[PDB]
Amino acid sequence: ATNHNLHITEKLEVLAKAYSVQGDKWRALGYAKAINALKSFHKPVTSYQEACSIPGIGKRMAEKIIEILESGHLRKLDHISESVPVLELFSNIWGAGTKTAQMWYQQGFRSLEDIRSQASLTTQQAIGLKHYSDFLERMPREEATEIEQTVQKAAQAFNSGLLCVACGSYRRGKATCGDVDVLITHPDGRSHRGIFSRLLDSLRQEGFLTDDLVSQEENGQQQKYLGVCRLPGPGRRHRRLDIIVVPYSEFACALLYFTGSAHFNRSMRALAKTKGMSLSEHALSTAVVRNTHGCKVGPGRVLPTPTEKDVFRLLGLPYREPAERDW
DNA sequence: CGGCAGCGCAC
DNA sequence: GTGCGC
DNA sequence: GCCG
Numbered sequence: 133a134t135n136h137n138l139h140i141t142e143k144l145e146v147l148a149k150a151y152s153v154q155g156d157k158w159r160a161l162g163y164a165k166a167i168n169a170l171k172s173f174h175k176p177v178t179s180y181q182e183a184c185s186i187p188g189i190g191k192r193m194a195e196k197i198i199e200i201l202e203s204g205h206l207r208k209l210d211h212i213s214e215s216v217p218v219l220e221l222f223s224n225i226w227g228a229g230t231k232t233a234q235m236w237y238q239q240g241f242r243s244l245e246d247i248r249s250q251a252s253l254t255t256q257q258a259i260g261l262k263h264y265s266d267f268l269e270r271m272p273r274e275e276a277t278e279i280e281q282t283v284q285k286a287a288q289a290f291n292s293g294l295l296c297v298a299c300g301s302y303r304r305g306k307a308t309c310g311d312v313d314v315l316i317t318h319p320d321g322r323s324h325r326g327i328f329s330r331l332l333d334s335l336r337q338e339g340f341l342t343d344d345l346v347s348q349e350e351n352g353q354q355q356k357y358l359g360v361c362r363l364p365g366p367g368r369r370h371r372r373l374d375i376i377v378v379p380y381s382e383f384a385c386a387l388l389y390f391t392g393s394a395h396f397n398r399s400m401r402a403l404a405k406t407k408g409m410s411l412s413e414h415a416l417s418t419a420v421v422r423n424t425h426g427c428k429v430g431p432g433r434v435l436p437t438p439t440e441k442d443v444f445r446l447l448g449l450p451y452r453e454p455a456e457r458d459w
Numbered sequence: 460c461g462g463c464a465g466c467g468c469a470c
Numbered sequence: 471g472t473g474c475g476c
Numbered sequence: 477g478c479c480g
């Protein structure tokens with residue numbers, strides 16, 4: 133689906149990014165939705181009225197869209213803080229968001245070297261810093277595959293019936309991936325237990341895992357590892373690797389959630405809500421019970437979903453292949 | 460206007 | 471509790 | 477930022 137409003141979506145992507153790095157995440161969200169629409173519009177935008185007919189574009193966005201169309205420029209871009217470029221540089225560090233970026237900028241830091249030399253860093257940020265270049269580049273789809281295989285082989289050594297699948301952008305079919313998320317479960321419903329720990333162990337012993345960002349995260353019955361790996365071989369880069377072990381009963385929803393994209397998940401939650409349901413990485417459930425004051429005082433009932441299709445079906449939706457989940 | 464999900468971790 | 475990424 |  134070619135974009136017929138490039139010079140517009142280009143200038144808008146700059147302003148969006150600017151708001152994002154300065155902390156205005158919600159406004160950044162709005163821009164990103166509007167920018168998507170502009171790209172997937174069935175043709176070029178020629179009027180303010182036309183612009184306003186596209187869901188996701190309101191008066192203010194139309195206003196900007198038309199300014200670029202007619203004038204070829206966007207004044208707003210000229211008044212963007214000079215700090216932006218640096219705030220982005222600092223936030224490209226895994227573990228450092230806008231607040232940390234702003235703090236470092238206020239302390240007079242300007243380069244990655246200043247950070248490395250005078251900045252106070254958290255354990256995660258330090259790891260993020262030494263792997264700045266590596267974590268910045270998207271890896272070839274092929275390397276993501278090898279990483280998944282490495283995890284799978286080591287997991288199946290403990291139990292051959294385990295099911296492993298790489299999610300994220302990789303499962304959505306992208307040529308390159310910024311990271312790998314390996315979701316692991318077992319069809320029998322309980323043999324996935326007591327796998328997480330010895331698996332990370334096995335992978336560390338063989339030198340595959342080089343750094344831990346979060347060694348273990350317990351979310352209900354889901355165990356998640358956020359770390360860094362590097363395949364054997366000279367010239368291999370370090371890569372962001374996540375490992376998630378979940379009970380089979382939550383495999384579908386976990387698969388759906390970690391395959392994303394983040395915009396897709398967002399739309400699915402919104403839709404669940406309209407049907408009186410909630411969708412999480414754990415399950416599709418009826419909405420929670422709330423008292424007169426309108427406050428969660430009783431979880432909803434989980435609606436069993438063996439496969440992703442079951443989730444789409446219960447939401448009265450046509451199944452969407454992973455490759456079609458960018459938005 | 461409030462919602463745009465809500466979680467667990469490191470600090 | 472806040473900041474961050476999932 | 478947009479939406480209801």
Ligand SMILES: C[As](C)(=O)[O-]
Pocket residue numbers: 479
């Ligand atoms: C101000 As309005 C069109 O978002 O209700």
Ligand SMILES: [Mg+2]
Pocket residue numbers: none
């Ligand atoms: Mg507001």
Ligand code: NA
Pocket residue numbers: 222223224225226227228229
């Ligand atoms: Na960051």
